[PDB]
RNA sequence: CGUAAAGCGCACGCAGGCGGUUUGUUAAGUCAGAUGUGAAAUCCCCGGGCUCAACCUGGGAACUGCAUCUGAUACUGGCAAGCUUGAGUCUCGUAGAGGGGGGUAGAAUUCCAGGUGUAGCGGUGAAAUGCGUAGAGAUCUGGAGGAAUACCGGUGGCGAAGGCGGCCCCCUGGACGAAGACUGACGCUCAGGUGCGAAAGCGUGGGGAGCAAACAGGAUUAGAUACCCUGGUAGUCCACGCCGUAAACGAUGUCGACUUGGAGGUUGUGCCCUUGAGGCGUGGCUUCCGGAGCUAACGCGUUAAGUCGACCGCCUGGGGAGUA
């Protein structure tokens, strides 16, 4: 059931991508957005778009560089069944540094490079590379 | 499974008006209606095991709905079960 | 823009999902390809095609079917170009080194047709040895001499030529090919939409390819 | 955890876990900093002392922890009030071996009665046992009774599973579709618990045509406690109540979202000179084939065994043992 949307996002992406699908949409939310943000701002998607009002609709434009998709792997990490939280010193780094980890902090949803520089930590929503 | 006349009658006896059809109280009451009706179908027969399944489904549906109301508006809950005559 | 009078598209169901981007069809139980997206594929098509033909064109107009074999042993055959118009003896690229002597037997025989031994031995051996040569001739004509190693490859019907194309992909050979709606692209580097087993789209583009190798740098 | 160990036979559901979307607030989880504390030894790093080393020793580092204070508010939790797509309710219809009860029909078998008719019938590989001169079998007519419903009939349909096929009425469950209207997260899952659950089997009473464990006879065979034959009891049928198991199998737990295609079957519904027995769409279910992908392979493949998440069940070498 709907129960975990954020994985559903991570997934609708993962999938469409593997389906060399141009765009991809889904029910939106404060949260979906903030991540679609980091995802664009870190250059894993072209650009997002939320087209509705009562029943908002996040829409992401996918990217493809060579022939490949740009997003080579996108996984949940925290989840309803099992929440993950890391302190600053204990934040994770994906692919040695390449690619990134989305972490939500008391100062908003930012990357790991980010939250690290911000000197704090929070819930590690997902990994991406 | 209950009449249009009958089901209507009760919407009109429990909701704001005919149309306020999905009002908690209403659902409960037109459920409660069919359950009781049925008591006699299963009085005779009794081996109608299959149909029995549907009836329980009615009871547990109603049960969950009753549970909802109570949490929401306790005031409305109590009135209901009195007026519907259950929860001994 | 268009030039293909009546090759429009072709091929009914049997359509290959991956061939959607070049389809605008839907006429009476059959796709018309996207005419207006084929021609931008003469651009690039005959371009890197020629861009090498002046760097020196070695080709292989590979295309078979007792229904267009001869129409390939043509000005397709004639120019800076080799060809195959019969059963693609599998491994003829990937095993050229074995096959290279299936050549020696062709020559060392016809070179000896109106020469060498010939009207001699028995009049059994006679046409009972020209059957050796006849057989060889088709499927191993166009090969004759391969002077400059097979360099690009131009194929009529992508999938019908499973093997040919495959070998290329394996040996790093450009493969220019036209792909009907039904066929699987991506085996083909330079892809050309539109019909691939009708007497026109052949000759047309076929003949038109002969026209760009046969002239690049005088 | 399809076929190797492993999905409970099926469902409903308490506790529990998890839970769409918006704004406010809370600050428990979470995060930040500060302070105290985290015995020494030990470990580790750099040294120093015993001829070296083990050994001894200086000083750091480390003790990933705990608590207090103050902060941060994205996520989670709490409180509040909403929201409409999740989930329900309502309206008219549609298909159906879905369930329960009662009624009823023709075809056959067995039996009873009678006409005609006469020496065999029946059965096997071949036989014999058996049946017939008290007239069999064969045929015809009338009658009794039980059991099951040919054709339709179909990788057809319904049900949670078990499983449900003549026809008719009554009672009744679920599913699906088309419009909009109402509720407003009322949801998902579910250890425990409760219900249902083929056949055989048990209890009391019926009922008994055919079939048939047991048992008897006849054969076959080296033997024949069998396979075959002639018989035939429980049982197979009804009511009431037990039992609770099956290769209860898709050997594939339930719910949700996402991801190229192709040819059927079945069932709703919108549009098109209905002007064709149709034309183009749009749901539910179903069979075959097949792409990525997955797989030890076989295979699966939008009805997943692909890609993800929520909860539950279960596996941890064979035998011993699903035994004590
Ligand atoms: Mg097993
Ligand atoms: Mg099961
Ligand atoms: Mg949310
Ligand atoms: Mg210490
Ligand atoms: Mg020393
Ligand atoms: Mg909150
Ligand atoms: Mg009779
Ligand atoms: Mg009779
Ligand atoms: Mg019904
Ligand atoms: Mg039971
Ligand atoms: Mg029984
Ligand atoms: Mg009995
Ligand atoms: Mg017997
Ligand atoms: Mg068992
Ligand atoms: Mg398949
Ligand atoms: Mg399909
Ligand atoms: Mg799955
Ligand atoms: Mg036991």
**C-alpha B30 to ligand 5 mean position (Å):** 96
Domain ranges of chain A: 1-71, 72-129
**C-alpha C12 to ligand 7 mean position (Å):** 62
Question: Which residues, in sequence order, are CB contacts of C22 under 8 Å at separation 6+?
Answer: C33, C34, C37, C38, C191, C193
CA A38 – CA A108 distance, rounded (Å): 11
Q: Are residues A116 and A44 in contact, defined by beta-carbon separation less than 8 angstroms?
A: no
Residue nearest to nucleotide D100 (CA to C1'): B48
CA C140 – CA C88 distance, rounded (Å): 9
Determine the CATH number of domain A1-71. 3.30.1370.30
Q: Are residues A69 and A17 in contact, defined by beta-carbon separation less than 8 angstroms?
A: yes
Instruction: Give which of C145, C144, C139, C184 is closest to C165, Cα–Cα.
Output: C184
The vertex-C160 CA angle with C165 and C101, nearest 5°, equals: 55
CA A111 – CA A100 distance, rounded (Å): 7
Q: Which helix (H) or strand (E) holds B14?
A: helix B4-14
CA C166 – CA C194 distance, rounded (Å): 21
**C-alpha C114 to ligand 8 mean position (Å):** 99
Output the six-digit token pair for C16: 């290959």
Query: CB B31: neighbour CB atoms within 10 A?
Result: 20
Q: Are residues C192 and C185 in contact, defined by beta-carbon separation less than 8 angstroms?
A: no
Span CA (B51) to C1' (D152), Å? 29
CA B16 – CA C120 distance, rounded (Å): 114
Beta-bridged to residue C83, according to DSSP, are: C61
CA A79 – CA A6 distance, rounded (Å): 9
Instruction: Give which of A27, A121, A32, A124 is closest to A79, Cα–Cα.
Output: A124
**C-alpha C17 to ligand 4 mean position (Å):** 70
Span CA (C99) to C1' (D52), Å? 77
Question: What range does the domain containing B26 cover?
Answer: 1-88
Cα B49 from chain centre:
21
Span CA (C111) to C1' (D256), Å? 75
Output the six-digit token pair for C98: 């074995």
Looking across all nucleic acid strands, the nucleotide with the smallest C1' to CA distance from residue B15 is: D182
Place of tokens 């019908």: C160
Kindly state the DSSP code that residue C43 receives in the 8-state scheme: T
CA C123 – CA C146 distance, rounded (Å): 33
In our burial notation (b when 16+ CB lie closer than 10 A, e otherwise), range C144-155 reads eeeeeebbbbbb
Query: Which CATH number belongs to the domain containing residue B66 in this structure?
Result: 1.10.287.10
**C-alpha A2 to ligand 5 mean position (Å):** 70
Angle, helix B49-71 to helix B24-39, in steps of 10 degrees: 150
The set of strand D positions with any atom below 7 Å of a protein CB reads 11-14, 17-23, 29-33, 71-76, 83-92, 98-101, 159-162, 171-174, 181-188, 195-197, 240-241, 255-263, 292, 306-311
Kindly state the DSSP code that residue C197 receives in the 8-state scheme: S
Span CA (B45) to C1' (D25), Å? 58
**C-alpha B41 to ligand 11 mean position (Å):** 26
- Chains that contact C by 3+ CB pairs under 8 Å? none
Beta-bridged to residue A60, according to DSSP, are: A24, A48
CA dist list (Å): C63 to A31, C20, C76, C94, C211: 57, 24, 11, 18, 17
Query: CB C106: neighbour CB atoms within 10 A?
Result: 19
Where does residue A96 rank: exposed (0-12), middle (13-18), buried (19+ CB within 10 A)? Answer: exposed
Looking across all nucleic acid strands, the nucleotide with the smallest C1' to CA distance from residue A79 is: D309
Looking across all nucleic acid strands, the nucleotide with the smallest C1' to CA distance from residue B6 is: D90
Residue A79 main-chain phi, psi, to 5 deg? 180, 165
Q: How many domains does chain B have?
A: 1
Looking across all nucleic acid strands, the nucleotide with the smallest C1' to CA distance from residue B16 is: D182
Q: Are residues C203 and C216 in contact, defined by beta-carbon separation less than 8 angstroms?
A: no
Question: Which residues, in sequence order, are CB contacts of B2 under 8 Å at separation 6+?
Answer: B30, B33, B34, B37
Pair type for strands C83-84 and C61-62: parallel
Span CA (C134) to C1' (D115), Å? 92
Span CA (B21) to C1' (D76), Å? 37
Span CA (B2) to C1' (D106), Å? 39
**C-alpha C19 to ligand 15 mean position (Å):** 22
**C-alpha B58 to ligand 5 mean position (Å):** 90
Looking across all nucleic acid strands, the nucleotide with the smallest C1' to CA distance from residue B31 is: D89
CA C204 – CA A101 distance, rounded (Å): 55
Instruction: Mark out the alpha helices in chain A (DSSP H runs).
Output: 5-18, 30-41, 112-117
Looking across all nucleic acid strands, the nucleotide with the smallest C1' to CA distance from residue A88 is: D31
Q: Are residues A61 and A77 in contact, defined by beta-carbon separation less than 8 angstroms?
A: no
For every residue of C131-166, DSSP letters joined together read HHHHHHHSSSTTTS--SS---S-EESSTTTTHHHHH
Of 3.40.50.880, 3.30.1490.10, 3.30.470.30, 3.40.50.300, the CATH number of A72-129 is: 3.30.1490.10
Resolution of the coordinates, Å:
2.9
Query: CB A84: neighbour CB atoms within 10 A?
Result: 14
């Amino acid at each position: 059931s709907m129960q975990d949307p954020i994985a559903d996002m991570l997934t609708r992406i993962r999938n469409g991508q593997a389906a060399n699908k141009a765009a991809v949409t889904m029910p939106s939310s404060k949260l979906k957005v903030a991540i679609a943000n980091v995802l664009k701002e870190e250059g894993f998607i072209e650009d997002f778009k939320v087209e509705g009002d009562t029943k908002p609709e996040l829409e992401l434009t996918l990217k493809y560089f060579q022939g490949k998709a740009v997003v080579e792997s996108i996984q949940r990490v925290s989840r309803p069944g099992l929440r993950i939280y890391k302190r600053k010193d204990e934040l994770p780094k994906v692919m040695a540094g390449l690619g990134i980890a989305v972490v939500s902090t008391s100062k908003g949803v930012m990357t790991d490079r980010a939250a690290r520089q911000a000197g704090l930590g929070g819930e590690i929503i997902c990994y991406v590379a | 499974s209950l009449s249009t006349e009958a089901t209507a009658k009760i919407v009109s006896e429990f909701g704001r008006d005919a149309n306020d059809t999905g009002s908690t109280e209403v659902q409960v009451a037109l459920l409660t209606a069919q359950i009781n009706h049925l008591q006699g179908h299963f009085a005779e027969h009794k081996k109608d095991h299959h149909s029995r399944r549907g009836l329980l489904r009615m009871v547990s549906q109603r049960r969950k709905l009753l549970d909802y109301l109570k949490r929401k508006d306790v005031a409305r809950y109590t009135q209901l079960i009195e007026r519907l005559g259950l929860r001994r | 823009m268009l030039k293909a009078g009546v090759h429009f598209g072709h091929q009914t169901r049997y359509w290959n999902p991956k061939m959607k981007p070049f389809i605008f069809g839907a006429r009476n139980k059959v796709h018309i390809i996207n005419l207006e997206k084929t021609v931008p594929m003469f651009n690039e098509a005959l371009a890197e095609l020629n861009k090498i033909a002046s760097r020196k064109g070695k080709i292989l107009f590979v295309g078979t079917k007792r229904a267009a074999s001869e129409a390939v042993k043509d000005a397709a055959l004639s120019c800076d170009q080799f060809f195959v118009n019969h059963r693609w003896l599998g491994g003829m690229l990937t095993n050229w080194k074995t096959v290279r002597q299936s050549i020696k037997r062709l020559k060392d025989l016809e070179t000896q047709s109106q020469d060498g031994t010939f009207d001699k031995l028995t009049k059994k051996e006679a046409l009972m040895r020209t059957r050796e040569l006849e057989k060889l001739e088709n499927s191993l004509g166009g090969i004759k001499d391969m002077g400059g190693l097979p360099d690009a490859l131009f194929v009529i019907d992508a999938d019908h030529e499973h093997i040919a194309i495959k070998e290329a992909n394996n040996l790093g050979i450009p493969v220019f090919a036209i792909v009907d709606t039904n066929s699987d692209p991506d085996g083909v580097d330079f892809v050309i939409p539109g019909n691939d087993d009708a007497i026109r789209a052949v000759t047309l583009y076929l003949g038109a390819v002969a026209a760009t190798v046969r002239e690049g740098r005088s």
